[PDB]
Amino acid sequence: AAQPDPCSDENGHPRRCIPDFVNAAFGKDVRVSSTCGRPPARYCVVSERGEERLRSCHLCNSSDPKKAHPPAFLTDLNNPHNLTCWQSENYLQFPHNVTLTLSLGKKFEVTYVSLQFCSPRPESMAIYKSMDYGRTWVPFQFYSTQCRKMYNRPHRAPITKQNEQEAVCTDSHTDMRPLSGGLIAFSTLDGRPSAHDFDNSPVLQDWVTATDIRVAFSRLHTFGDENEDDSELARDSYYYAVSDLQVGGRCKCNGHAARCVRDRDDSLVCDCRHNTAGPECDRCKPFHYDRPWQRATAREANECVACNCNLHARRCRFNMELYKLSGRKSGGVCLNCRHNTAGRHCHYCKEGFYRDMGKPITHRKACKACDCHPVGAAGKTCNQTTGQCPCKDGVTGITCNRCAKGYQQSRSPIAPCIKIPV
Amino acid sequence: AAQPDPCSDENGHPRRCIPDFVNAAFGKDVRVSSTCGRPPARYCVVSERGEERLRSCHLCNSSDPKKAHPPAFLTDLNNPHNLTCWQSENYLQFPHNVTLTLSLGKKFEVTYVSLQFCSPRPESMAIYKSMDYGRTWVPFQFYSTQCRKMYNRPHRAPITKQNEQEAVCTDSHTDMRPLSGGLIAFSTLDGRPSAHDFDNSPVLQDWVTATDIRVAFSRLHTFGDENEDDSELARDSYYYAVSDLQVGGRCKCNGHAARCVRDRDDSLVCDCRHNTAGPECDRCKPFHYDRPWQRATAREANECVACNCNLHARRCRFNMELYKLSGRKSGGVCLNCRHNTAGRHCHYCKEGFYRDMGKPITHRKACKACDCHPVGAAGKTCNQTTGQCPCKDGVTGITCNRCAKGYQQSRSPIAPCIKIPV
Ligand SMILES: *[C@@H]1O[C@H](CO)[C@@H](O[C@@H]2O[C@H](CO)[C@@H](O[C@@H]3O[C@H](CO[C@H]4O[C@H](CO)[C@@H](O)[C@H](O)[C@@H]4O)[C@@H](O)[C@H](O[C@H]4O[C@H](CO)[C@@H](O)[C@H](O)[C@@H]4O)[C@@H]3O)[C@H](O)[C@H]2NC(C)=O)[C@H](O)[C@H]1NC(C)=O
Ligand SMILES: *[C@@H]1O[C@H](CO)[C@@H](O[C@@H]2O[C@H](CO)[C@@H](O[C@@H]3O[C@H](CO[C@H]4O[C@H](CO)[C@@H](O)[C@H](O)[C@@H]4O)[C@@H](O)[C@H](O[C@H]4O[C@H](CO)[C@@H](O)[C@H](O)[C@@H]4O)[C@@H]3O)[C@H](O)[C@H]2NC(C)=O)[C@H](O)[C@H]1NC(C)=O
Ligand SMILES: *[C@@H]1O[C@H](CO)[C@@H](O[C@@H]2O[C@H](CO)[C@@H](O)[C@H](O)[C@H]2NC(C)=O)[C@H](O)[C@H]1NC(C)=O
Ligand SMILES: *[C@@H]1O[C@H](CO)[C@@H](O[C@@H]2O[C@H](CO)[C@@H](O)[C@H](O)[C@H]2NC(C)=O)[C@H](O)[C@H]1NC(C)=O
Ligand SMILES: *[C@@H]1O[C@H](CO)[C@@H](O)[C@H](O)[C@H]1NC(C)=O
Ligand SMILES: *[C@@H]1O[C@H](CO)[C@@H](O)[C@H](O)[C@H]1NC(C)=O
Ligand SMILES: [Ca+2]
Ligand SMILES: [Ca+2]
Ligand SMILES: [Cl-]
Ligand SMILES: [Cl-]
């Protein structure tokens, strides 16, 4: 409304535009492996304060909305002082994997994934992404007190330039453990050495990109003393619960759009600009092949450029050697010049025709036929630039259609203009 | 031998030449209708002196050479004081036609026909020519005392410009009649008003031309008184006799030869020069059609001119309009230029080729192909004068086979030379 076009300058010149930052999980329906309440079943909160165990107990009943704890409560608006949470099934045996999967449907770039717990935090969990609509999954971040044993990872691996795309493991989640309200937050870029100029890092750009997100919990904080780790069987306090799940980032458009939006088929997609196309504006638009696709940046917008064919070609092709040689200015090449033109830009007239000046090069019929005079000219093909036909001695005119001054017209087809003698 | 070429200058330049003047009848065998001596038979000379008739009589015997009087004696060398003469049969009735026919076999121009009589001269005779080898005959001159009656001609008709080709009749032969040694002489040109510049009179030129010559005698000078013209029957003095017949002129060559001469088949013909041909040098030689045939004159030789085709044509054609327009200099036109040349003189290179300078225009291969570079040039056909092909941007060379300074070679066939940018 009162927002001017972000994809272009105040002079109409292109500039980079990126969709707004969002929690991309807000309002979304998250898929989970486990939820309490079917069949209804009692659970207990355990309480630590002093040296006393208040085992407070309530009923998870999925058919009772006052007592239901559905995945929906993960991405509803979170009001503290009145929290809602999803809560897993109870009595979790070990080993296990209680998964939450957020499917975005469209590549985003993600700056963080975060959760607020109603229960205590897991001893162990992981976060994973899919960059391909959920056919494959890839570790994003690990949390655990036995990184090695549980996930086979070094604890707290330093991140090198050599692999800053590396999913590390840590126990930082354990620092100062409350049993409620526990926050975990994975910033995709914390501690990655190229973070400072993300804009020019393609490796981080890949790292942070995903279409879906999975968090899996695989071990509960052991309580009840666990003096005998013998107690394999579980209890009604053996569940996870979460009040809010967020995935912070923005829609992936390579700096060539100001928003994503819902098409026909209800699918999210970039509103591509800069004469770009594809769901992420990952490629140039037709006939806009003057130079290579580039992702925009702070300084350069890198719009896709229309190749020039002076209105004599439908299609266009990019040629890198030409680009290279031009000093990376232009490499487009026209195909099937159409109005008896020829050349790279359909910018000159095929032999057999010539350049009708006073009409401009863009003009349908900027190329005129050689209509060389049968008897006055010495051949059929005229000068493509100038129109001039090859004239016999004594002849003039563009088409050789006249004797010159000093000459007299014969009725010989071979020699039609003879010089006045003296 | 010690005679330099008469048909050319002392600088080798053409000049008019004409065969020598001859009596063309000398030595020739003349055909006659009547000769005495078969069978042998007595004849009489009648003699006038005082008032006495010496009827001297001798025998014409054709088998006796001391007494034979054959046509041969008409053109044998005449020695006066020892004359020889042919003599007709005797007893000539009236009317009659005793004819002598000289066949030259070749057109001559004739300045006179002359005869010396042994008998008295005829009262009436005529001379005729053939301009066509004796198929037709045409009056040349008439002699008679009754021009009107005998030849149906006005006596002594004045000659007008209006017909100076007119055969007149006269009685001049009768002036001071001896009975022996009588001379008659017809000069073809006496009294013809154009005679003075014959050289430029085509009508006299035609008048004097012939191939054969006939003299016919048709009435004898009446003697014996002829008091009674009743005497129809004739007598042994009623014959003609002639010692010498001459036909003065020269062989017809239109000023383009210094002699006639006897070819294969024994026929007389001009030794034509000035690049002329035909029995009278009446036409130009092959490939020598630059200008029209002309008869030579005192000032201008009017040689036939070779047309110029710079050694690229076998045949040649004359064109009068071109001649006219050139100011009557030249009108020749070459046919089937042969080494990929074209034009009037095969003097320029067909489209598809061009003029290889440093080789001369006469050179087989003075025309070189356009070998325009497939990728460097913008079309196949090059400049016929210069060789230059139509070059793409950045290309140079006659064949467009190189990038210019400032340009770099691509491996695109469309645009093979790109400018170094700045
Ligand atoms: C988890 O939470 C759910 C939701 O509260 C609880 O499930 C029960 O849900 C049913 C809903 O049907 C509630 O049943 C109620 O009690 C009646 C007792 O019997 C009388 O019913 C009819 C009244 O309509 C009389 O005509 C008849 O004479 C009986 O004496 C039920 O029968 C009623 O159900 C009625 O609902 C259906 C449609 O659902 C109608 O078509 C029928 O007519 C039917 O009568 C009535 O709704 C029940 O109260 C809920 N239980 C509660 C609140 O305790 C589970 O109980 C809860 N689970 C646990 C373990 O807490
Ligand atoms: C017009 O002019 C001609 C030419 O003079 C005259 O014709 C005569 O021509 C013949 C030529 O043969 C002359 O004849 C001569 O007189 C001979 C007389 O008879 C004797 O002949 C042979 C000699 O060879 C004897 O053996 C024999 O016993 C005879 O007694 C002729 O016979 C001769 O002719 C011989 O010639 C031929 C070839 O021609 C031979 O093969 C024969 O053997 C043959 O004998 C001999 O030549 C004759 O003299 C001529 N007459 C003359 C001079 O008066 C005409 O007379 C003349 N006409 C007129 C009217 O005047
Ligand atoms: C817990 O359940 C999830 C959801 O099905 C399992 O997902 C697999 O996870 C492994 C390891 O990350 C991947 O290699 C597979 O691609 C996932 N499969 C599917 C179908 O999504 C996960 O394996 C389970 N946990 C354990 C320990 O087995
Ligand atoms: C005398 O004889 C000559 C020779 O045959 C005749 O020639 C003809 O002459 C006439 C008149 O000149 C021509 O028209 C003919 O062409 C000639 N004919 C031939 C065959 O040559 C001539 O006619 C004779 N004289 C007379 C009076 O008849
Ligand atoms: C939020 O408001 C009150 C605060 O006391 C709470 O008890 C109630 O259950 C909540 N209402 C909702 C979530 O609709
Ligand atoms: C010519 O010479 C003499 C001269 O007296 C003459 O009588 C003779 O017949 C002639 N001889 C010839 C024509 O052979
Ligand atoms: Ca909530
Ligand atoms: Ca003689
Ligand atoms: Cl295109
Ligand atoms: Cl020729």
User: Hey, are the CB atoms on A384 and B392 less than 8 Å from each other?
Assistant: no
- What is the CA angle B301-B305-B308, rounded to 5? 155
Could you tell me the two tokens for B158? Answer: 């004045």
Give the whole-angstrom CA distance, residue A96 versus residue A238.
12
Give the whole-angstrom CA distance, residue A341 versus residue A354.
9
Residue of B nearest to A318 (CA): B412
- Count other Cβ atoms within 10 Å, centred on residue A392: 22
Give the whole-angstrom CA distance, residue A288 versus residue A304.
6
Q: What is the DSSP string of A121-156?
A: PPSEEEEEEESSTTSS-EEEEEE-S-HHHHHS--BT
CB proximity A320 to B under 8 Å: no
Q: Is the CB of A60 under 6 A from ligand 1?
A: no
Could you tell me the two tokens for A193? Answer: 């050495």
The resolution in angstroms reads: 2.6
Q: Please tell me the distance in Å from A306's CA to the nearest CA on chain B.
A: 19
Number of CB pairs, chain A paired with chain B, less than 8 A apart: 75
Residue pair B404/B377 in contact by the 8 Å Cβ criterion: no
Which residue out of A320, A341, A346, A351 would a mutagenesis test of the B interface target, given it has the greatest number of B Cβ atoms within 10 Å? A351
Residue pair B355/B385 in contact by the 8 Å Cβ criterion: yes
With H, G, I as helix, E, B as strand and everything else as coil, classify residue A91. coil
Burial class for A395, CB neighbours closer than 10 Å (0-12, 13-18, 19+): buried
What is the DSSP secondary structure assignment for residue A272, as one 8-state letter? -
Which one, of B130, B83, B80, B135, lies nearest residue B107 by Cα?
B130
Q: Please tell me the distance in Å from A326's CA to the nearest CA on chain B.
A: 6
Residue pair B309/B28 in contact by the 8 Å Cβ criterion: no
Which one, of A295, A278, A212, lies nearest residue A247 by Cα?
A212
Which one, of B200, B263, B177, lies nearest residue B16 by Cα?
B200
Residue pair A247/A97 in contact by the 8 Å Cβ criterion: no
CB proximity B354 to A under 8 Å: no
Query: Is-cis flag, bond preceding A39, omega within 30?
Result: yes
CB proximity A412 to B under 8 Å: yes
Give the whole-angstrom CA distance, residue B279 versus residue B296.
15
Query: Atom of ligand 3 at shortest distance to CA of A137?
Result: 16
> Percentage helix, strand, coil, to 5, in chain A?
10, 30, 60
Chain centroid to Cα A3, Å, comes to: 23
What residues pair up with B408 in beta bridges, in sequence order? B418
Which one, of B193, B198, B124, lies nearest residue B155 by Cα?
B124
One-letter amino acid of A292: P
The continuous run of DSSP H or E covering A208 comes out as: helix A202-208
- Count other Cβ atoms within 10 Å, centred on residue B37: 20
Torsion sign (Cα): B308, B314, B320, B325: negative
With H, G, I as helix, E, B as strand and everything else as coil, classify residue A203. helix
Which residues fall within 8 angstroms of residue A170, CB to CB, at 6 or more apart?
A141, A142, A143, A144, A147, A155, A156
- What is the CA angle B128-B129-B134, rounded to 5? 120
User: Hey, are the CB atoms on A410 and B322 less than 8 Å from each other?
Assistant: yes
Give the whole-angstrom CA distance, residue A303 versus residue B256.
91
B73 alpha carbon, closest ligand: 8
Q: Kindly compute the dihedral angle of the four CA atoms of residues A374, A379, A384, A385, in this order, to the nearest 10 degrees.
A: -90
A325, A343, A412 ranked by CB distance to B321: nearest = A412
Please state whether beta strands A276-277 and A283-284 pair in parallel, antiparallel, or not at all (unpaired): antiparallel
What is the phi/psi pair of residue A193, to 5°?
Answer: -65, -30
Exposure string for A108-124, b = 16+ CB within 10 A, e = fewer: bbbbbbbbbbbbbbbbb
CB proximity A354 to B under 8 Å: no
Exposure string for B285-312, b = 16+ CB within 10 A, e = fewer: bebbbbbebbbbeeeebbbbbbbbbbeb
Residue pair B243/B85 in contact by the 8 Å Cβ criterion: yes
Please state whether beta strands A56-60 and A41-45 pair in parallel, antiparallel, or not at all (unpaired): antiparallel
With H, G, I as helix, E, B as strand and everything else as coil, classify residue A167. coil
Query: Atom of ligand 4 at shortest distance to CA of B139?
Result: 12
Breaks (C-N over 2.5 A) in chain A follow: none
Best probe residue, ligand 2, of B64, B66, B67, B69 (max atoms within 8 Å of C-beta): B64
User: Hey, are the CB atoms on B412 and A326 less than 8 Å from each other?
Assistant: no
| CA distances to A69, A127, A220, A398 from A97, in Å | 19, 12, 11, 88
- What is the CA angle B184-B188-B194, rounded to 5? 145
What is the DSSP secondary structure assignment for residue A307, as one 8-state letter? P
With H, G, I as helix, E, B as strand and everything else as coil, classify residue A388. coil
Give the whole-angstrom CA distance, residue B23 versus residue B109.
11
What is the DSSP secondary structure assignment for residue A82, as one 8-state letter? S
Q: Please tell me the distance in Å from A330's CA to the nearest CA on chain B.
A: 11
Ramachandran category for residue A385: left, alpha or beta (phi over 0 → left; psi -120 to 50 → alpha): alpha
- Count other Cβ atoms within 10 Å, centred on residue A301: 20
Give the whole-angstrom CA distance, residue B61 versus residue B90.
12
Ramachandran category for residue A203: left, alpha or beta (phi over 0 → left; psi -120 to 50 → alpha): alpha
One-letter amino acid of B32: V
Q: Which residues of A touch B376 (CB under 8 A)?
A: none
The continuous run of DSSP H or E covering A207 comes out as: helix A202-208
Residue pair A209/A107 in contact by the 8 Å Cβ criterion: yes
One-letter amino acid of B7: C
Could you tell me the two tokens for B53? Answer: 């008739």
Residue A130 CA to ligand 3 centre (angstroms): 12
Q: Which residues of B touch A414 (CB under 8 A)?
A: 333, 343-344
CB proximity B407 to A under 8 Å: no
With H, G, I as helix, E, B as strand and everything else as coil, classify residue A281. coil
User: Hey, are the CB atoms on B381 and A348 less than 8 Å from each other?
Assistant: no
- Count other Cβ atoms within 10 Å, centred on residue A78: 17
Which residues fall within 8 angstroms of residue B121, CB to CB, at 6 or more apart?
B173, B174, B177, B182, B184, B221
Residue pair B118/B85 in contact by the 8 Å Cβ criterion: yes
CATH code of the region B1-272: 2.60.120.260
| CA distances to B340, B341, B380, B389, B398 from B366, in Å | 9, 9, 20, 18, 17
Which residues fall within 8 angstroms of residue B231, CB to CB, at 6 or more apart?
B224
Per this entry, what is the length of chain A? 422
Residue pair A133/A61 in contact by the 8 Å Cβ criterion: no
| CA distances to B64, B91, B162, B237 from B57, in Å | 16, 14, 51, 9
Give the whole-angstrom CA distance, residue A392 versus residue A384.
19
Residue pair B376/B395 in contact by the 8 Å Cβ criterion: yes
Q: Which residues of B touch A415 (CB under 8 A)?
A: 322, 333, 343-344
Give the whole-angstrom CA distance, residue B74 versus residue B314.
52
Residue pair B45/B237 in contact by the 8 Å Cβ criterion: yes
A381, A392, A411 ranked by CB distance to B381: nearest = A381
Give the whole-angstrom CA distance, residue A408 versus residue B326.
9
Per this entry, what is the length of chain B? 422
Give the whole-angstrom CA distance, residue B91 versus residue A85.
175
Residue A44 CA to ligand 5 centre (angstroms): 21
Give the whole-angstrom CA distance, residue B240 versus residue A232.
180
Which residue out of B291, B351, B411 would a mutagenesis test of the A interface target, given it has the greatest number of A Cβ atoms within 10 Å? B351
One-letter amino acid of A138: V
Domain ranges of chain B: 1-272, 273-422
Q: Is the CB of B138 under 6 A from ligand 4?
A: no
User: Hey, are the CB atoms on B342 and A390 less than 8 Å from each other?
Assistant: no
- Residue carrying structure tokens 């051949």: A379
Which residues fall within 8 angstroms of residue B356, CB to CB, at 6 or more apart?
B363, B365, B366, B367, B368, B387
Give the whole-angstrom CA distance, residue A179 versus residue A121.
7
Q: Is the CB of B152 under 6 A from ligand 4?
A: no
User: Hey, are the CB atoms on B329 and A421 less than 8 Å from each other?
Assistant: yes
Q: Which residues of B touch A343 (CB under 8 A)?
A: 378, 392, 414-415
- The three state secondary structure string of A348-383 is EECECEEECCCCCCCCCCCEEECCCCCCCECCCCCC
- The three state secondary structure string of chain B is CCCCCCCECCCCCECCECCCCEECCCCCCCEECCCCCCCCEEEEECCCCCCCCCCEEEEECCCCCCCCCCHHHHCCCCCCCCCCCEECCCCCCCCCCEEEEEEEEEEEEEEEEEEEECCCCCCEEEEEEECCCCCCCEEEEEECCCHHHHHCCCECCCCECCECCCCCEECHHHCCCCCCCCEEEEECCCCCHHHHHHHHCHHHHHHHEEEEEEEEEEECCCCCCCCCCCCCCCCCCCCCEEEEEEEEEEECCCCECCCEEECCCCCEEECCCCCEECCCCCEECCCCCCCCCCCCCCCCCCCCCCCCCCCCCCEEEECHHHHHHCCCCCCEEEECCCCCEECCCCCEECECEEECCCCCCCCCCCEEECCCCCCCECCCCCCCCCCCCCECCCEECCCCCEECCCEEECCCCCCCEEECCC
Q: Which residues of A touch B410 (CB under 8 A)?
A: 321-322, 325
Give the whole-angstrom CA distance, residue B201 versus residue B164.
11
Burial class for B105, CB neighbours closer than 10 Å (0-12, 13-18, 19+): middle
Residue pair A233/A226 in contact by the 8 Å Cβ criterion: no
Q: What is the DSSP string of A248-259?
A: EEEE--TTB-S-
User: Hey, are the CB atoms on B343 and A421 less than 8 Å from each other?
Assistant: no
Query: Is-cis flag, bond preceding A95, omega within 30?
Result: yes
Residue pair B209/B252 in contact by the 8 Å Cβ criterion: yes
Residues 360-389 of B with CB under 8 A from A: 378-381, 383-384
- Count other Cβ atoms within 10 Å, centred on residue A350: 17
- What is the CA angle A209-A8-A311, rounded to 5? 105
Could you tell me the two tokens for A240? Answer: 């996870």
- What is the CA angle A74-A79-A84, rounded to 5? 40
Give the whole-angstrom CA distance, residue A301 versus residue A12.
12
Burial class for B25, CB neighbours closer than 10 Å (0-12, 13-18, 19+): buried
CB proximity B348 to A under 8 Å: yes
Give the whole-angstrom CA distance, residue B278 versus residue B144.
40
A75 alpha carbon, closest ligand: 7
Q: Kindly compute the dihedral angle of the four CA atoms of residues B1, B4, B8, B10, in this order, to the nearest 10 degrees.
A: 150
Which residues fall within 8 angstroms of residue A245, CB to CB, at 6 or more apart?
A25, A30, A74, A75, A100, A102, A114, A115, A116, A215
Which one, of B80, B91, B76, lies nearest residue B36 by Cα?
B91
Give the whole-angstrom CA distance, residue B12 versus residue B6.
10
Exposure string for B257-269, b = 16+ CB within 10 A, e = fewer: bbebeeeeeeebb
Could you tell me the two tokens for A266? Answer: 């209800």
Which residues fall within 8 angstroms of residue A187, CB to CB, at 6 or more apart?
A111, A112
Residue of A nearest to B411 (CA): A321
With H, G, I as helix, E, B as strand and everything else as coil, classify residue A260. strand
Q: Is the CB of A99 under 6 A from ligand 3?
A: yes
Which residues fall within 8 angstroms of residue B84, CB to CB, at 6 or more apart?
B69, B73, B76, B78, B243
Which residue out of B412, B419, B420 would a mutagenesis test of the A interface target, given it has the greatest number of A Cβ atoms within 10 Å? B412
Could you tell me the two tokens for B7? Answer: 């048909």
